[PDB]
Amino acid sequence: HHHSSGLVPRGSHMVGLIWAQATSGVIGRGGDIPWRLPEDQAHFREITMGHTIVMGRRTWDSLPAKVRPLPGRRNVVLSRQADFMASGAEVVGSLEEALTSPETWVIGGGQVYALALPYATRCEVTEVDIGLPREAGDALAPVLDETWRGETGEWRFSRSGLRYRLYSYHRS
Ligand SMILES: NC(=O)c1ccc[n+]([C@@H]2O[C@H](COP(=O)([O-])OP(=O)(O)OC[C@H]3O[C@@H](n4cnc5c(N)ncnc54)[C@H](OP(=O)(O)O)[C@@H]3O)[C@@H](O)[C@H]2O)c1
Ligand SMILES: CCc1nc(N)nc(N)c1OCCCOc1ccccc1C[C@H](C(=O)O)C(F)F
Ligand code: NA
């Protein structure tokens, strides 16, 4: 399949998704992420810093009030509620309104990844080797079809004592 370039022309609209999942596909439960890996936190910041980040309203809610908006990035929150407000950030009503920058990283959660996938050309995935089964109401990662080509890293070992690995996926 035809080659893509890592360089982002300023007149384009590159959309990437970045998430961390358990091997089962779980990304969230009860309004939180059920792990903290320093390597994943650092990786998330390395990829997203300097770009626009787009998140669903429930992901904004999951950020501690003292830390949001996440610094060094333009924070955009998706909501359908006309009275939802995000101090320090922009709330918009659609993905179309959110995707105005040349490079945008969609940072969660389950609903917004599913919504944004049709426009995305990159996914950066951390897989955590934690035995966490899927339960009703869990937020889940998108499943990538065969239009996506991927590179899977070898299993690595976190200082937190969990194995993890990184995937990078691309499509035209
Ligand atoms: N592991 C990770 O990488 C990762 C990353 C981020 C989040 N998470 C976890 O994922 C969970 C949250 O995911 P979630 O799926 O429940 O929610 P979400 O995707 O973060 O947010 C859903 C909300 O976004 C808004 N929304 C959805 N579709 C929209 C559309 N088409 N237009 C406008 N607004 C739209 C709605 O807000 P309104 O209800 O206000 O209308 C909806 O309730 C939490 O557990 C969080 O901790 C995990
Ligand atoms: C690191 C998690 C993650 N990892 C990958 N790979 N992709 C993602 N989209 C992702 O979610 C980013 C959005 C949710 O962030 C939070 C959720 C609850 C509490 C604190 C934070 C802020 C983070 C922290 O300090 O833990 C900070 F590092 F961003
Ligand atoms: Na990742």
Curated annotation (Swiss-Prot):
GO terms under biological process: dihydrofolate metabolic process; folic acid metabolic process; one-carbon metabolic process; tetrahydrofolate biosynthetic process
Residues involved in substrate binding: 18-20, 40, 45, 73, 113, 126
Q: What is its EC number?
A: 1.5.1.3
Superkingdom of this protein's organism: Bacteria
Q: Give me the reactions it catalyses.
A: (6S)-5,6,7,8-tetrahydrofolate + NADP(+) = 7,8-dihydrofolate + NADPH + H(+)
Keyword annotations: NADP, One-carbon metabolism, Oxidoreductase
Q: Where does NADP(+) bind?
A: 19-20, 27-32, 56-59, 78-81, 93, 107-112
Task: Spell out the molecular function terms from Gene Ontology.
Answer: dihydrofolate reductase activity; NADP binding; NADP+ binding
What is any Pfam family matched here?
Answer: DHFR_1
What are the record's GO terms for cellular component?
A: cytosol
Q: What regulates this protein's activity?
A: Inhibited by isoniazid metabolites. The prodrug isoniazid is metabolized to isoniazid-NADP adducts that inhibit the enzyme at subnanomolar concentration.
Uppermost EC category: oxidoreductase
Q: What is this protein called?
A: Dihydrofolate reductase
Organism of origin: Mycobacterium tuberculosis (strain ATCC 25618 / H37Rv)
Give the taxonomic lineage as stored in the record: Bacteria, Bacillati, Actinomycetota, Actinomycetes, Mycobacteriales
Q: Which gene encodes it?
A: folA
